Design a protein around this nucleic acid. Structure first.
Lengths: 78, 78
DNA sequence: CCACGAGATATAACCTAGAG
DNA sequence: CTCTAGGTTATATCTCGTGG
């Protein structure tokens, strides 16, 4: 219900395998480890979205400001 | 509670300039454009997290999976 | 399930002006 | 007076195979 590691949520999201979350994302199993090994801060949110999407949840990017908040609603990968 | 361009949220705050953000970001006031002229999807989760901090905001990334959600928290200086 | 080697383009970056 | 847009350089993010 709070995590620093993408792999750690996949384990929380049933028996999701690294080669299955690879398969739906149209890329290698290699790429996917290099993903959850990667610094998130040095992940493009697209490449992040693509993943959480791959586990069948939707990535909600809020920019808070004391009251005025801003939800970030941008899609369309290459 | 907007949803579109980064410039939009700056604009949306006090009439802050991409100059004195750039400053609080310590990069050119060029980049800051190339940021808001960019495709979010192809931007580093921190790039944003940085921009949004600079506007006195707190970037909040959730990956919600129906009933439960996972707030992403990965913070240790580059 | 990670490294081992291999290799794109473009993200993140500069400064110096040029369009709005 | 503010942003976009030349003109350049590059570190690593994003890709891949196959084999620790």
């Amino acid at each position: 219900v709070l995590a620093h590691r993408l792999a750690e949520i996949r384990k929380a999201l049933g028996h999701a395998r690294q080669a299955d979350v690879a398969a739906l994302m149209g890329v290698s199993q290699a790429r996917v480890s290099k993903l959850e090994s990667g610094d998130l801060s040095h992940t493009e949110l697209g490449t992040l979205q693509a993943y959480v999407a791959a586990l069948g949840g939707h990535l909600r990017i809020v920019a808070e400001f004391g009251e005025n908040t801003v939800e970030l609603t941008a899609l369309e990968h290459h």
